[PDB]
Amino acid sequence: MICYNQQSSQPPTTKTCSETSCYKKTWRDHRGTIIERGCGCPKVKPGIKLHCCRTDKCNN
Amino acid sequence: MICYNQQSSQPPTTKTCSETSCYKKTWRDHRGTIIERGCGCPKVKPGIKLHCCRTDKCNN
Amino acid sequence: SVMEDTLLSVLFETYNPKVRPAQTVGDKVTVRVGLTLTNLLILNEKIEEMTTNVFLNLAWTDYRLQWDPAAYEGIKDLRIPSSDVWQPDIVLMNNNDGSFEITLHVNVLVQHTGAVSWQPSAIYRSSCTIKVMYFPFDWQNCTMVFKSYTYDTSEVTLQHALDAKGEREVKEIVINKDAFTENGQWSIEHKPSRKNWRSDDPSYEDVTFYLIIQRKPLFYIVYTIIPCILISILAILVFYLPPDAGEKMSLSISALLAVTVFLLLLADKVPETSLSVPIIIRYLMFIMILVAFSVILSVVVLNLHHRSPNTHTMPNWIRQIFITLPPLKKDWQYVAMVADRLFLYVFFVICSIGTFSIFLDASHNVPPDNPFA
Amino acid sequence: ENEEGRLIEKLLGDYDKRIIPAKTLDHIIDVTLKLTLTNLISLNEKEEALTTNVWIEIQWNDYRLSWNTSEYEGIDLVRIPSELLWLPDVVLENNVDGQFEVAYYANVLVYNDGSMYWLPPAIYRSTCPIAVTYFPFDWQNCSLVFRSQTYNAHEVNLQLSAEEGEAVEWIHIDPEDFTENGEWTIRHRPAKKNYNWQLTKDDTDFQEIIFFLIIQRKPLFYIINIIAPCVLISSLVVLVYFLPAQAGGQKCTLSISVLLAQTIFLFLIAQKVPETSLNVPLIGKYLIFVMFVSMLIVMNCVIVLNVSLRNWVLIGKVIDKACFWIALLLFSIGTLAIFLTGHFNQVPEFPFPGDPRKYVP
Amino acid sequence: SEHETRLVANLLENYNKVIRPVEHHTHFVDITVGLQLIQLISVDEVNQIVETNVRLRQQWIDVRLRWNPADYGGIKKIRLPSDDVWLPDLVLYNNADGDFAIVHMTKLLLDYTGKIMWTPPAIFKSYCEIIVTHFPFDQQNCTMKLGIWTYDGTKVSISPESDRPDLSTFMESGEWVMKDYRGWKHWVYYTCCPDTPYLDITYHFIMQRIPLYFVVNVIIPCLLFSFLTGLVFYLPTDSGEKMTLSISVLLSLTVFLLVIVELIPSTSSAVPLIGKYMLFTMIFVISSIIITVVVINTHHRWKYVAMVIDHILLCVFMLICIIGTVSV
């Protein structure tokens, strides 16, 4: 399964992984907003939005 | 009877009292060596050398 | 702005804040001292100390910092940092710790006429005597004195502050209702302000702010009075139990152990001042002595109950008096019961009268309407 | 006119306090320091911190601050404030808080030949692990580590002061103006220069001067308030064997009330023992043992009551008498052995076990 | 030395500590950050604060502080104070109530090539996530996060000098053991700004609480009272000591609850093993009281059935006490 592993608005970058899920994690801190991308989709602290997905390259 | 009432290396001085003994109390502090002289002799804290002497002009 | 910079450069060309302002040699600078009490933090009596957060109003006229606003783009006042302008050393004198000077150095406000204003906030920890003899049902005077540490009455003349619209002086600690939090255990009844002199010292003068505050004892009332009342109820009940149950000492000494437990509870919260005994400690000791006498009299009752003709012979005086008050062993239990009922009535009278007298003495303690200040 | 003004203005002119006073390269500033303890303020085992008031003196040489006494009206000693001169940054490294430096920055006494005599008093919250094995009958071996904070062994040479030609390898104590802490007595007080051979000549941690303080607690407050009350109260569990085993004999309440009093003593000792989890305190071991003894007392009372109220009462009394001696002997030998072990714990008569010297004037 | 005086004078004639020491403002100042653990002052579970004594090793190159040793007598190292040069403002991103930056000056070593070696001490009070679930047999993995407060990655970059902190001079805590300790450098990018990295370093220490103080202070008496409370059932009901023994061991357990509640951390994040075992003992005692009151009621209502009930209850409560003290 191929999905983006970049962070925030970097140039796109992909990685191979055995999980059937790929997530986009977005949250805001005292400076700005952070977008985190990777495989699977684990539990997150309250106040963070997550985008569990199943197809290839869907966490853009 | 007469003892010495000087202290340390002061010019010699003499005194008379009702006790028949003298003493020379010498101890070391952070700045030098102190010598205390008079007549009789009392109990002292540890670390001090006494010269309890019964004769006359013996605590020089 | 550029004009403000020009005015600041002109004003501070030859001005040093270490020289007292004086038009003529020997002149006095009238300093107005005021206080706004933001909140009364704590008045713990273990260390005999009161902590307050206050704004200390100051107002003195400095002739060197005056100008013509017509020549400076119509600017009437400036905000100059307090370290660039002379101020009197108006400090707290009766402070428990070593903090004399104001905590926060806000910049001063100077008008074009030379008038200078200063409202520096401070966390002042002042020491004040605690009259612990009606504790906790007490009110504390707990004064707070302000004066210039270095300048005396021959160089400065302290005065009372002025209200917002300034025609008449204010002689009391004013409170900003927008910024004020009640302590929750203290209520500010009187808050006067008065200048003090000393006849022995003609070169002395201060401005003093008092706080006649009366404690709210609900916490102490509940947590000590109510269990003490229950302990008194147990101690008065232990008589009514029958001697044959053989359990009077259990109840009596358990009540005594409980009252010692509350002594342990309260020993932390009572001040360690030996001037006088507070009401609460006197009440605790009264209850403890009452329980001790209950134990002693119940031991007497048990001893009279278990006596037997084979060991004790009835004297004539107890027979007539205890079989007089009601208006061979069976006589012993009867005398035991009569003595028990007499002790019950006697301790009812003693406990009720003592408790009512103590609470009436501690309830007629009210701060005076005139704080004599 | 005070000529000391002329000396100060001449010496401090073109004098930089950020410069090592080395004349050239390969010149090492020999710093001689001796410690004079004034008060042993406290030692709290909860924080594992030792608080003392000490007057450390520091001596060293500065070639830039020497003059000719002949041309300056014959004066040779001048006092210069410490903030205007270069100072060797000797600090107490093993401190619980961040107070590395001295408390009072006293004036520095300069001499004719550029010698220095700085005696700044200081209060140090030094750290030392607590050996709780023999508490409260314990002796603590607490240290005070002094090393230069910035300069290494190639720039300064820390060493002990030399008085009358012999190095003062001890913490100086004023015998007549010193009072005991009241809980701790000072037995040994050696001082030795130490090297960290695991670390090279550089890196500022090679050399150090260590001032030890072997102190033994005075166990008088603990005995009369914790130890003796505990042993006296729990000596009462052997009296359950003389009470009758019937209704009103009333053994179980005695045993359980002595146990609850021991629990109250466990609360009392909870505020005194430290939080170190390396060894069980000796008094803690005794408390656990004596509660176990009370446990045997309670169980034995239970079986005695069961037998005397079933079987027959006389066999119950025989069991009672037989086990009374066992319980009394057990309690006596346990308490005697524990308190003998506590009492026999004494400070070693050598400051360093392998070093034959006494390290005392 | 007069030569070193000439160094200190010349190097600081036109030196601004306000301005970072880089040849061109586009470039970045590279800093190698290192941590040297010394001791653990304390670990506060209720306040979730870990206080430690550390010295922060910082190395970086200054281009404006170069000199030729041959021109100045051959010296190659000086000891300028901190307040005379530029300083990276390394701060704790998870400070609880300590000092964010470093408040100790501790004059820094300066090589002739411009390299600067600064090792100031600090008392880091890092906010620590305390997990009270296996207390006291618990493991702590709370860290300290370091980073440049005002400069970003493309201006001032910090790199760890070693993959793990320095514990060559560590002093044993007495109640904590370091299983592992490492250091990681994090790259974080913001949506505002695709090419502005922000760098930080987190030094995480694994800590094992030594379970001896709480075991001999809190665990032993819980088991002690628990084994007591099941023993009351073997007493005959004829003796009037059943309720006395049972309620008195309950009262001793109450005083023990008092000492525990003043001893163990008061944090309410989760119930620990201490809390679970205390609850188990308390429930055991309460059930013992209730059922043995029923036993006395059976006696004074029957003696044989009361005795056999007492033996059965004794066996059952021995069994459940053992399984409860083994499971927890």
Place this chain on the structure above:
Amino acid sequence: SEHETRLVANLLENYNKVIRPVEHHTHFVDITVGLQLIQLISVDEVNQIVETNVRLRQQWIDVRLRWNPADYGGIKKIRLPSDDVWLPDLVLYNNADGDFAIVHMTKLLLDYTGKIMWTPPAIFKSYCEIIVTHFPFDQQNCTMKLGIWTYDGTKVSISPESDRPDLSTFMESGEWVMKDYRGWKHWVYYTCCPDTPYLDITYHFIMQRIPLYFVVNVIIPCLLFSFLTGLVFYLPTDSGEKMTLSISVLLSLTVFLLVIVELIPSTSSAVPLIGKYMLFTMIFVISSIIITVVVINTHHRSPHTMPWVRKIFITIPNVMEEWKYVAMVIDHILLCVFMLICIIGTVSVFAGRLI
């Protein structure tokens, strides 16, 4: 004032604050140091420290700070900040955990003749000498030693301003009462230095604790427990009730031991009077436990036969089932002797320091 500004500018032009004010280096600065005890903040015995709020008043003359009042318009007193002139460094020699010197500046008063009038405040945490032997009826005599740190007698000389410390504005402590306060000055010479005196001023205050808090919170419950523990012997053995009363008064006294050790200072220099009394009461209660146990064992004896015991216990009753009678006689004997022991011990433990 422009005149005062000009005067301040003139005085502080060539002035140097790191040189003592003497015309010739052989001279000494004459300083008169005096204290003003304002309050006694606290006296903790466990750390053996006394802390008080004072302000030490010292006077000296600075020759190079003089001026002619007629030249400057007539000003005679000026108020330079203390940070820019020469200051003697008086250091509390027995400082425990406070500040050796002062930290507050509190700008001084300067006279036209050069005299300096400087009274800065300071909280002295002076080390104390605590003797806990008659506590709480204890009198303390710990001192407050001051002297110049870096200078000696021949360079900076200090003398007391008044023979006694100034206590005109000393507020009442509330738990201490002061008998005497006194000020002494000592010269010490060293085996070095045959003509170099070293000077200091020692102020000692005789402090007596006000014994009312400890008497009515720590002693009266001890009296009650001591009275009650010996009274169990009046309670007949027939009720299974002696044991509960005696062990429960012991337990209450143990709780009172908890609170007393929470209150009493934890110093271990010597056993205090309160500690001696509580140890006595512990021993008294324990002895009552053993005596009650042996009495109970006597009561429930039953046929072994009763021996001379009946000869003395069935002559003792003549000067005021058989096992119960002898137990009753023994109980009354023990109650009488235990009341006597309790009262005589209570009188004797506090006999002295109260008579």
Place this chain on the structure above:
Amino acid sequence: NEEERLINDLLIVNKYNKHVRPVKHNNEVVNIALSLTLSNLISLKETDETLTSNVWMDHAWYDHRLTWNASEYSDISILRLPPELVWIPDIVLQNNNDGQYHVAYFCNVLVRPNGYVTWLPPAIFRSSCPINVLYFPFDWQNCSLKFTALNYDANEITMDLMTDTIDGKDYPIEWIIIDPEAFTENGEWEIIHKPAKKNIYPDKFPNGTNYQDVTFYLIIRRKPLFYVINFITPCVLISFLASLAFYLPAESGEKMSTAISVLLAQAVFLLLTSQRLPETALAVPLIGKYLMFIMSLVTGVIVNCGIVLNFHFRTPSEVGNWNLVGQTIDRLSMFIITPVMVLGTIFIFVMGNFNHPPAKPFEGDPFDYSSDHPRC
């Protein structure tokens, strides 16, 4: 390094004065926008009513003097200057127990070519905030941090709120910013509402330091787990034993012992809870109300079983009749009082347990002040 030339031109060449506020004429106002980032909540221990918390208060103001042309120099887009060289508007926390009014670390600022200065100094603040113990331990505390500008009046500077952008529109930051990833929840306190508000007091005049205010409220609800495990459950169980003491026969004269010992355990629990709350007299704590109710009930239990014991041991000077009378009155008293205790405890502890915060701060304001749904 063009930074040297830029700093020298800005601060020294132009004669920058840090003690004069940055206005063109002395009639304009300085717009100062504030935010507050709560790094962590340290504690709110109730003895001193302190709210100690590490916060990251963020400033943003315009300084016309700190402007330059980027193209004239090298393309320097961001500049950094220590606070002691630039005009720093000192706002302070008006309510705090300790004497710390300013921020902890006076960190470096960031200034842009247009003069936009941003300052984010970390700070540890120990504010004073009252505590209502009425529903302890199930209570929620509503106490705040109050920030005011005491150096300049509202006629000179204005304390606004930070405004950000999502879709080209500006909306004020009306809440305390919490970093969801970095923030670890406190072990005793749970943050429910974090509203931020700018306060203007019409009572006073603009020419005064106390006319404007920015308040950062914090409504936090305690986690009732420690107290329901070490204070509620054992007390309830021993109260249940006190109630059950009536089911004990009077033949064994040992009921008084059980009742009085339960009362003594109640006294021990009172001792324990007396050191967990401030000496506030506004209202009785729920723990206090429950404890005094249960101790009064246990005293009634003791008195009533004492009545039962006295009735049982009556004599004509037949005894089975008195024994049955005692048993009947004991059963009647149990049936009367046990439901009373059970219902009272249940009612008290469900009344306490029903104390959720009103889910809407500023009751007269429909806005929830939540970061999920901004205003503009």
